[PDB]
């Protein structure tokens, strides 16, 4: 159920040595995808509708549905991301907390990759890193 | 302690599994990254952060490496590896070295494979790149 999200910042010396910095975060695995570990470069997704090498983690901030103009539901977004090569997808569901029920509903065919949600403190934390800059890596762990 | 290694291959996407073990040289955790062939002897190349290194160890008395098995694990992590996987078929003693009661375990997993599991891994590495590993602790 619980997904431990480790966000990695890293920098290299021009002699190829890396120093990594890590910051922890919690969400939940949803029934929309599998309960397994995942790891990849973070990509902030954008609503409207391959743009990236296979293996990315998609991060989506959802908006309040009454005001949401998007075509894709939360489940539509999870599906597309995986079709387009994501190894996992993390949704921020603070604006749309019905989205959890939607992601946890009985699944006609659940995706092979993790579909995780965060909210509260842990989302502000995520979106502060997703915005601040790219080149962050997400480790999604299942304990 | 068993480590489940799923390898993703491309041409569009398909999967194929195999098993090994988590050594005490590193942690017991999951990791995932593009596979990178590590040379059986290195130094004695810069990559993107987050690769999974994979190397076949030679018999130690035939091994010209500057780096011990541990040394290759630490160096791989320094150079941005998310995990390291050793085929230890030809060096059983590498197992005892990776399992030393260690004050100094790495935060990343340091896995080893052998027998047919390893033959399957190394064949993928020898052939050509565009492979990605996911290491799971079930």
Author numbering:
A (entry chain A): 31 to 79, 88 to 181
B (entry chain B): 31 to 41, 49 to 81, 88 to 181
From the paper:
Direct extracellular interaction with Rspo proteins inhibits ZNRF3/RNF43 activity. Here we report a molecular level analysis of the ZNRF3/RNF43 ectodomain structure and its interactions with Rspo proteins.
The ZNRF3ecto crystal structures revealed a distinctive variant of the protease-associated domain topology. Two β-sheets (comprising β2, β1, β7, β3 and β4, β5, β6 strands, respectively) splay apart, accommodating an α-helix (αC) at the open edge; two additional α-helices (αA and αB) pack against the β4, β5 and β6 face of this distorted β-sandwich. A disulphide bridge, conserved across species, links two structurally elaborate loops, β3–β4 and β4–αA. The crystal structures for apo xZNRF3ecto, zZNRF3ecto and mZNRF3ecto showed no major differences in the main chain conformation. Comparisons of ZNRF3ecto structures for proteins crystallized in several different crystal lattices, or for crystals containing multiple copies in the asymmetric unit, consistently highlighted an acidic region (N105-E114; residue numbering is for mouse sequences unless otherwise stated) within the β3–β4 loop, the short αC–β7 loop and the extended β1–β2 hairpin as flexible elements of the fold. Our crystallographic data provided independent structures for multiple copies of the ZNRF3 ectodomain in eight different crystal forms. All but two of these crystal structures reveal an extensive interface (average interface area 992±109 Å2) formed between two ZNRF3ecto polypeptide chains. The β1–β2 hairpin forms a second interface by reaching out to embrace helix αA and the β3–β4 loop in the opposing subunit.
